[PDB]
Design an enzyme around this catalytic site. Structure first.
Site, short mmCIF file in Angstrom:
data_model
loop_
_atom_site.label_atom_id
_atom_site.label_comp_id
_atom_site.label_asym_id
_atom_site.label_seq_id
_atom_site.Cartn_x
_atom_site.Cartn_y
_atom_site.Cartn_z
N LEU A 59 0.82 -1.20 0.00
CA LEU A 59 0.00 0.00 0.00
C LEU A 59 0.86 1.26 0.00
CD1 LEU A 59 0.15 0.28 3.35
CD2 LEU A 59 -1.69 -1.38 3.18
N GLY A 111 6.03 4.94 0.75
CA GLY A 111 6.10 6.20 1.50
C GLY A 111 7.46 6.86 1.46
N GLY A 151 11.24 3.49 2.19
CA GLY A 151 10.58 2.27 2.68
C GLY A 151 9.30 1.93 1.94
N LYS A 210 6.87 -3.39 7.55
CA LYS A 210 7.65 -2.46 6.76
C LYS A 210 8.95 -3.07 6.47
CE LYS A 210 9.04 1.96 7.88
NZ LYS A 210 8.66 3.37 7.59
N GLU A 248 1.10 -2.80 14.27
CA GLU A 248 -0.33 -3.02 14.32
C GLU A 248 -1.04 -2.64 13.04
OE1 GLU A 248 -1.01 -0.70 17.99
OE2 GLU A 248 -1.62 -2.62 18.84
N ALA A 253 -4.46 -1.21 11.55
CA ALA A 253 -5.57 -0.38 11.95
C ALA A 253 -6.55 -0.39 10.80
CB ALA A 253 -5.09 1.03 12.22
N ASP A 279 4.68 16.07 11.87
CA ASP A 279 3.61 16.09 10.85
C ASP A 279 2.33 15.48 11.39
OD1 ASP A 279 2.31 16.46 8.38
OD2 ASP A 279 2.98 14.50 7.65
N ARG A 289 -4.46 12.60 8.54
CA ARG A 289 -3.91 11.54 7.64
C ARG A 289 -2.96 10.63 8.40
NH1 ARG A 289 -1.75 16.18 5.16
NH2 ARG A 289 0.05 16.71 6.47
N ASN A 290 -2.23 11.21 9.34
CA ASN A 290 -1.33 10.50 10.26
C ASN A 290 -1.90 9.95 11.57
OD1 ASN A 290 1.12 10.50 8.86
ND2 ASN A 290 1.02 12.73 8.96
N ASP A 349 3.54 7.14 12.43
CA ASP A 349 4.75 7.77 11.84
C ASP A 349 5.44 8.78 12.75
OD1 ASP A 349 4.16 6.20 9.57
OD2 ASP A 349 3.47 7.92 8.39
C1 LIG Z 1 -5.22 -4.14 8.55
C2 LIG Z 1 -6.03 -4.08 7.27
C3 LIG Z 1 -5.82 -2.78 6.51
O1 LIG Z 1 -6.26 -2.65 5.38
N1 LIG Z 1 -5.17 -1.84 7.19
C4 LIG Z 1 -4.93 -0.65 6.64
C5 LIG Z 1 -5.26 -0.21 5.44
N2 LIG Z 1 -4.78 1.02 5.37
C6 LIG Z 1 -4.91 1.90 4.22
C7 LIG Z 1 -4.89 3.36 4.64
O2 LIG Z 1 -5.24 4.16 3.53
N3 LIG Z 1 -4.22 1.33 6.35
C8 LIG Z 1 -4.25 0.32 7.19
N4 LIG Z 1 -3.76 0.30 8.41
C9 LIG Z 1 -2.49 0.48 8.70
C10 LIG Z 1 -1.55 1.04 7.87
C11 LIG Z 1 -0.24 1.19 8.33
N5 LIG Z 1 0.77 1.74 7.62
C12 LIG Z 1 0.52 2.13 6.24
C13 LIG Z 1 1.99 2.03 8.16
O3 LIG Z 1 2.86 2.57 7.50
N6 LIG Z 1 2.20 1.66 9.43
C14 LIG Z 1 3.31 1.91 10.08
C15 LIG Z 1 3.26 2.98 10.91
CL1 LIG Z 1 1.91 3.79 10.94
C16 LIG Z 1 4.37 3.31 11.65
O4 LIG Z 1 4.24 4.40 12.44
C17 LIG Z 1 5.38 4.88 13.15
C18 LIG Z 1 5.51 2.54 11.54
C19 LIG Z 1 5.53 1.44 10.70
O5 LIG Z 1 6.59 0.62 10.55
C20 LIG Z 1 7.83 0.94 11.16
C21 LIG Z 1 4.42 1.12 9.97
CL2 LIG Z 1 4.43 -0.11 9.03
N7 LIG Z 1 0.02 0.81 9.58
C22 LIG Z 1 -0.91 0.27 10.41
N8 LIG Z 1 -2.17 0.12 9.93
#
Ligand SMILES: */C=C\C(=O)Nc1cn(CCO)nc1Nc1cc(N(C)C(=O)Nc2c(Cl)c(OC)cc(OC)c2Cl)ncn1
Length: 287
Positions: free
Chosen positions: A23, A26, A29, A53, A101, A103, A150, A154-155, A168
């Site tokens: 998805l 970003g 990564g 990630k 996690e 979300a 930020d 959206r975040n 993030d």
């Molecule tokens: C669980 C099903 C699902 O579809 N989840 C989903 C779909 N979307 C689309 C949003 O338009 N979002 C989610 N949930 C989701 C997304 C993410 N990331 C995209 C993400 O990058 N997570 C993340 C975050 Cl937020 C983070 O914050 C510090 C650090 C990360 O890795 C080091 C990652 Cl991977 N995350 C969680 N849920």
């Protein structure tokens, strides 16, 4: 090449991980949904949907170092209901996977939009609650010396059970104010004057953001400073112009927004305060 040290508190065997759809690539990564098997001694035959990630294959030595950093920072900051949390990592005998996690209802903004008048509808309590939860999360990170930089709908991500989680935060950053987001918006609309002008980022500017974040919330998904190009926003703020109060927004809340937007950073409230005010207000707010 590389070898990493393994901490067993956090190591998940990479075969307990079933990678699935991506998805978006970003800010460095690239992230993909997945199912972790086990995760819990209690119920070791259960899959749990997670976000994982990893590096894109066009990935520098730093690009890696960065991923390792934000992993290690998420370890330092620790768990809290209102942030996206680390659950594991795959460090050995393959590329690095940093699991967190899932979300399942997307970002705050998308979820707000999807719940406007003629998929359910948000009560007034449902909105202030939402601001309250973000303030909690922000307070938590702040308590851990984390400055977000930020902060906006959206975040903020939202779970099935409707919990706001901030995303993030441990983010390694480095400059185009015309750089457009997916939805077409500009990250400067959330930026506090001194962040904009003098590069000065603190809790106080994270509070300014939270102001605009409240504005987003009580406009069920609004787009800030509507049709006011970047250039103009420089001046307007300089002088002291502030966004307009939404309809379906109490003076109380509009006054919070305005304190989050105090011209003098030190006179803005802190998240600690803002949590305490939002708790009260939620209790006085009707379904
Ligand atoms: C669980 C099903 C699902 O579809 N989840 C989903 C779909 N979307 C689309 C949003 O338009 N979002 C989610 N949930 C989701 C997304 C993410 N990331 C995209 C993400 O990058 N997570 C993340 C975050 Cl937020 C983070 O914050 C510090 C650090 C990360 O890795 C080091 C990652 Cl991977 N995350 C969680 N849920």
């Amino acid at each position: 090449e590389y070898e990493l040290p393994e901490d067993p508190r956090w190591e998940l065997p990479r075969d307990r991980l079933v990678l699935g759809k991506p998805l978006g690539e970003g800010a460095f990564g690239q992230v993909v949904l997945a199912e972790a098997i086990g995760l819990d001694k209690d119920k070791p035959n259960r899959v749990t949907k997670v976000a994982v990630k990893m590096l894109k294959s066009d990935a520098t030595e730093k690009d890696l170092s960065d991923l390792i950093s934000e992993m290690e920072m998420m370890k330092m900051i620790g768990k809290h209901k209102n942030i996206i949390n680390l659950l594991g990592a795959c460090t050995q005998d393959g590329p690095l996977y940093v699991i967190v996690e899932c979300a399942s209802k997307g970002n705050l903004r998308e979820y707000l939009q999807a719940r406007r008048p003629p998929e359910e509808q948000l009560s007034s309590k449902d909105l202030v609650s939402c601001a309250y939860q973000v303030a909690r999360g922000m307070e938590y990170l702040a308590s851990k010396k984390c400055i977000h930089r930020d902060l906006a709908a959206r975040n903020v991500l939202v779970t099935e059970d409707n919990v706001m989680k901030i995303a993030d935060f441990g983010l390694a950053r480095d400059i185009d104010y015309y750089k457009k987001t997916t939805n077409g918006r500009l990250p400067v609309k959330w930026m506090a004057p001194e962040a904009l002008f003098d590069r000065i980022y603190t809790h106080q500017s994270d509070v300014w953001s939270f102001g605009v974040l409240l504005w987003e919330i009580f406009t069920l998904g609004g787009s800030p400073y509507p049709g006011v190009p970047v250039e103009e926003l420089f001046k307007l703020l300089k002088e002291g112009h502030r966004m307009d109060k939404p309809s379906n927004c109490t003076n109380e809340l509009y006054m919070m927004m305005r304190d989050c937007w105090h011209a003098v950073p030190s006179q803005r409230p802190t998240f600690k305060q803002l949590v305490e005010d939002l708790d009260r207000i939620v209790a006085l707010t009707s379904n």
